[PDB]
Design a protein around this nucleic acid. Structure first.
Lengths: 60, 154, 101, 118, 128, 215, 84
RNA sequence: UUGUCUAGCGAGACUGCUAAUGCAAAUUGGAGGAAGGAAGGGAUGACGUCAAAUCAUCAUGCCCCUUAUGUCUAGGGCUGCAAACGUGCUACAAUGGCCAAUACAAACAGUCGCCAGCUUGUAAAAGUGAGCAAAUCUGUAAAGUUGGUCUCAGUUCGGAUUGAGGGCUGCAAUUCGUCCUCAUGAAGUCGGAAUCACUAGUAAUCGCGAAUCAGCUAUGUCGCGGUGAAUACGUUCUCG
RNA sequence: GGUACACGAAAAACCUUACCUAGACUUGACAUCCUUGGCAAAGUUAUGGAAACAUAAUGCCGAGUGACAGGU
């Protein structure tokens, strides 16, 4: 499934290593980014419109 | 195609002032390291000075003169068969490939220390008995039968 | 002296807005107190985050984004509360935070 | 164990040409007996040729080292044990994947025709 | 008085001070001779190519401090500082020194590599 | 394929939708994951609001959200009919103790937003209204409103199986390879009885001479 | 393998063994932990371990028991060298 | 052995000048400069193309399931296995192997954290104890050099596999984490057929940081930094 | 094939996860449309049990009924 994974993620386990990070609006544990509790596709799409304050296209 | 592009120039050696020795520096250089190559350089000159003492230079450009090539091979086709004929080539590439032959035949030795085997191929080449001059003889000799398209170069 | 060692750190994620905020605050504090040292330029915390573009098979076609955080320092030993009052006339914009001790 | 000496070289590397004592345990024996290998000579004293064997046997016996190691191997073999079960029949047991490797325990190659048309 | 010189190479720099005093000077850096800081190798003549090709070392000191980089870039930086001091002291030699191409460093630094690259130009070994 | 030009001018010419920061990966993640949904609310909730944009402003755990539209006549509400519902949903979305307030206004030249035109054409799609009339109306409206040449394209079901027809229209200059253009882009997915229709609108506000600083 | 607990049992085997060693005459025990490793005082029994397909009941050795109980039985099914 | 350094505002190269040849455009040299003919690089992909890829990001038209393709945890599996490909790593070596001493950074991150440091240890680490919410605290940079040994051979090469023991996290390391100490020492003598990448800071080589994550045989990924070459004659062929 | 094969999948020992099997599970684990509740929702522990999970109190708070959601 897809939604029940999100539901069980937001729960509280009994051991401290059960937790797995994902995004909360569009979560994808596959290639997870815990830098901001987001996902790679999610960060990419929000960056296009500019929904993140500090997001910029990389300049060298 | 490649329109026009001048190549890089070498700098005079601070202790030899010889373009030939700079090309030696370049050819024996491996892994982007100068100091290790420079150690081999110092050992080579010192040992050439040590065993049968002469003048590092005199024997050096003597060997360079002996290994001077004549004709370099290039291949043409009728789209179905390769024919190899030799043409001319400037002096810089001649010297570079001659010193490359020297270094390659140097590394393909089986004595213990590098410095002594290096001095060995150098004195052998200066004596017209090393392996470096053999391929020059071969590239001069093949023109006996490759004259058919050495006449007309395309 | 009234409140020694006003060491206020300002944080923003840009350099141009950093320039604006620094100019604003270090020129509004003039007019009321003396002995203000120059704002020392500080290195920028750069973060490059390389990101896969396609949702499928490629690791070569990855873009990359930037996040740069900036900061400036104000070290004030000999001051009066006049500068503290002056801090409440023109507000720093919402993208800049303050650190104090 | 046995009696072995290098061709003509330092005393310590004789410990390398005997089993059960690699380079590390060699240096261990040296720092235990305070005997350092003098330059390219295997003859300094005559009593050392049994003195070193005393501490070597004190550690354990070479042939017996491998004897009880093989005994441990057949001990995994005798009783039902997955480690021993895979170890007995020429197959790796650790985290190594057996689909592109393990050849050193397999002979050089035993390749046969495959069916990639399907 | 002293001659303010600055040399730059491979994101490394060097401040250079020379004096017209009555001392011939002693080449040194990092409070040690270059024979011990720089490699004790061919670079001994490399770091003093201009001063041994023009304005022999008999009328100035060596007060050079380095910052950053490896060691070859340090040699380039100190040489750039030397030529800067030589130019500011005697600019009349400007014509005879620029032919040697002892001018500023030519910005050759390691590139800023990208995704799909191994040396900023090396490819991922294209296959079938 | 290509990338939206709104990000190509974001960070050097375009204003930030949100201006705030906090301790790294401690509460920044939670704050952004809340206010992004806060931002996404209104366009999903409302289709007849022609809302221009929303703006998040956070100041050390003090949060507020400006909203700007074209005509707030249906957004202010009779005796604050809408504002009470807005306050209720704001208390619903982001906590109960945080300070919550806003004001609704109109930005200068509200006609130059791609979002309102994209919503208008989406209405033209969801209402089973033909395509040509919508396209010609958009073209004539953007021509007579007063602006430089814009462009637009559509993709999706056009009342026919085997979707391989998509139409694009462009006028004037649309320099997608130019740093300073100040040109807005919108993308909308309208729901129809045959599937989803994706429409892209590039509206040209106009290049501003010597743009040396953010507007 | 814990270096602090000689063989880290999940501690739910303790209930089963304090039952069994007291009963000590019905060798099959309905308990299964692939992570269980018996101590010298939990030796001389069979273990009904669920492979995830079937409940295999096998007897345990009395000499080296410092190994995973699931390591004395195959974890899955295998086959010979591939020819089909 | 103090105004380098961090970084804002700018200046600064624009065929700007000249000889040169040309209707114009534009051409090669010289002066100069920090740099001369898109100063070096990134960032910026037109129409289409193969209906290539994703109805498993998402939204989603069909059809179907529904006391069931919905839920919750145990455990097993995504890691096997004659083979072959695709990619690394690292050897087949005295430019090297090991041993002692010694030269030197950038960035970058660090709050349940970064871990100075002390003591216990051959070691994984442990008890302990400062600064750092970060230009003050932290993270042996190595190649190099001084040498010493190995003395030219299946080697102190190569380190695989397996074995014993110790170490950490993790409810737990069997499936299928990994580190270190000790034991053994696999093929292997530069890899035909064919190929792949590369125009100077390039290739090659050497080290540092960040990443998901409790930790992790990621040699991989992302970058940072150090040393640092060769050939470019040329477009008959070969690919576009 | 070019245009997959250090890929999706920047972490497969619980989770990761879709799957083989065990236990339960049904206007529903989760959420929404009705009406009644403004304080008890977690957790807690011997209870059986490999494991969900029920008996004992503790500490947007909430019941039933229908309106169904979800499908890696």
């Amino acid at each position: 499934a897809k939604k029940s994974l999100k539901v069980k993620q937001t729960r509280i386990p009994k051991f401290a290593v059960r937790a797995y990070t994902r995004c909360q609006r569009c979560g994808r544990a596959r290639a997870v980014l815990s830098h901001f509790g987001v996902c790679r596709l999610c960060f990419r799409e929000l960056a296009y419109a500019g929904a993140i304050p500090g997001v910029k296209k990389a300049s060298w | 195609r490649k329109n026009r592009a001048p190549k890089r120039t070498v700098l005079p050696d601070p202790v030899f002032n010889n373009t030939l020795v700079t090309r030696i520096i370049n050819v024996i250089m491996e892994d982007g390291k100068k100091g290790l190559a420079q150690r081999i350089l110092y050992g080579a000159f010192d040992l050439i000075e040590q065993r049968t003492k002469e003048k590092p230079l005199t024997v050096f450009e003597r060997a360079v003169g002996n290994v001077m090539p004549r004709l370099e091979l290039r291949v043409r086709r009728i789209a179905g068969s390769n024919y190899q004929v030799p043409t001319e080539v400037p002096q810089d590439r001649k010297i570079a490939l001659a010193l490359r032959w020297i270094a390659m035949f140097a590394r393909k030795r089986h004595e213990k220390t590098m410095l002594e085997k290096i001095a060995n191929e150098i004195i052998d080449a200066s004596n017209n008995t090393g392996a470096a001059i053999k391929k020059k003889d071969d590239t001069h000799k093949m023109a006996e039968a490759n004259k058919a398209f050495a006449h007309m170069r395309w | 002296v009234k409140y020694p060692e006003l060491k206020i750190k300002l944080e923003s994620y840009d350099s141009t807005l950093l320039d604006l905020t620094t100019k604003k605050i270090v020129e509004v504090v003039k007019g009321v107190d003396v002995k203000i040292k120059g704002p020392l330029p500080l290195p920028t915390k750069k973060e490059v985050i390389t990101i896969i573009r396609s949702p499928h098979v490629d690791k070569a076609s990855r873009e990359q984004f930037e996040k740069n955080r900036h900061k400036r320092l104000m070290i004030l030993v000999d001051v009066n509360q006049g500068a503290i009052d002056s801090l409440k006339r023109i507000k720093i914009p919402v993208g800049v935070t303050l650190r104090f001790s | 164990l046995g009696i072995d000496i290098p061709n003509q070289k330092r005393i310590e590397i004789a410990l390398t040409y005997i089993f059960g004592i690699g380079l590390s345990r060699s240096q261990a024996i040296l720092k235990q007996a305070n005997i350092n290998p003098d330059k390219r000579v295997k003859d300094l004293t005559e009593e050392e040729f049994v003195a070193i064997r005393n501490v070597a046997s004190a550690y354990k016996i070479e042939g017996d080292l491998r004897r009880e190691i093989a005994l441990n191997i057949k001990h995994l073999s005798e009783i039902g044990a997955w480690r021993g079960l895979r170890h007995r029949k020429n197959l790796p047991v650790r985290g190594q994947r057996t689909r592109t490797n393990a050849r050193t325990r397999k002979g050089p190659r035993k390749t046969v025709a495959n069916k990639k048309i399907e | 008085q002293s001659y303010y010189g600055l040399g730059r190479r491979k994101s490394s720099s060097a401040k250079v001070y020379l004096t017209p005093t009555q001392d011939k000077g002693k080449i040194t850096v990092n409070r040690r001779d270059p024979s011990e800081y720089f490699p004790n190798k061919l670079v001994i003549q490399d770091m003093e190519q201009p001063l041994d090709l023009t304005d022999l070392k008999k009328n100035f000191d060596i007060n050079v401090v380095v910052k950053g980089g490896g060691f070859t870039g340090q040699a380039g930086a100190i040489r750039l500082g030397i030529v800067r001091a030589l130019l500011q002291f005697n600019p009349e030699l400007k014509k005879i020194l620029k032919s040697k191409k002892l001018t500023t460093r030519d910005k050759r630094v390691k590139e800023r590599k990208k995704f799909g690259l191994y040396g900023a130009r090396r490819a991922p070994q294209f296959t079938k | 394929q290509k990338v939206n030009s709104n990000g190509l001018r974001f960070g050097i010419n375009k204003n930030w939708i949100s201006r705030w920061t906090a301790n790294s990966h401690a509460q920044t993640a939670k704050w952004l994951i809340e206010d992004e949904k806060i931002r996404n609310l209104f366009f999903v909730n409302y289709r007849n609001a022609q809302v221009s944009n929303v703006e998040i402003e956070r100041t050390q755990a003090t949060v507020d959200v400006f909203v700007y539209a074209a005509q707030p006549a249906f957004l202010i509400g009779s005796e604050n009919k809408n504002i009470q519902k807005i306050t209720k949903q704001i208390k619903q979305i982001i906590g109960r103790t945080t300070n919550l307030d806003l004001t609704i206004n109109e930005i200068g030249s509200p006609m130059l937003s791609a979002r309102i035109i994209a919503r208008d054409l989406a209405n033209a799609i969801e209402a089973r209204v033909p395509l040509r009339t919508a396209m010609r109306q958009s073209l004539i409206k953007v021509l007579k409103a007063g602006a430089n040449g814009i462009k637009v394209l559509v993709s999706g079901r056009l009342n026919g199986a085997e979707i391989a027809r998509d139409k694009m229209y462009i006028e004037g200059n649309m320099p997608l390879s130019t740093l300073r253009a100040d040109i807005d882009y919108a993308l909308e997915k309208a729901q129809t009885t045959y599937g989803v229709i994706g429409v892209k609108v590039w509206i040209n506000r106009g290049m501003i001479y010597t743009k040396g600083l953010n507007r | 393998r814990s270096a602090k607990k000689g063989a880290f049992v999940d501690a739910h085997l303790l209930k089963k063994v304090i039952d069994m060693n007291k009963q000590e005459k019905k060798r099959p025990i309905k308990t299964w932990s692939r992570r269980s490793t018996i101590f010298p005082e939990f030796v001389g029994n069979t273990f009904a371990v669920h492979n995830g397909k079937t409940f295999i009941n096998v007897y345990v050795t009395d000499d080296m028991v410092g190994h995973k109980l699931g390591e004395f039985s195959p974890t899955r099914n295998f086959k010979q060298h591939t020819a089909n």
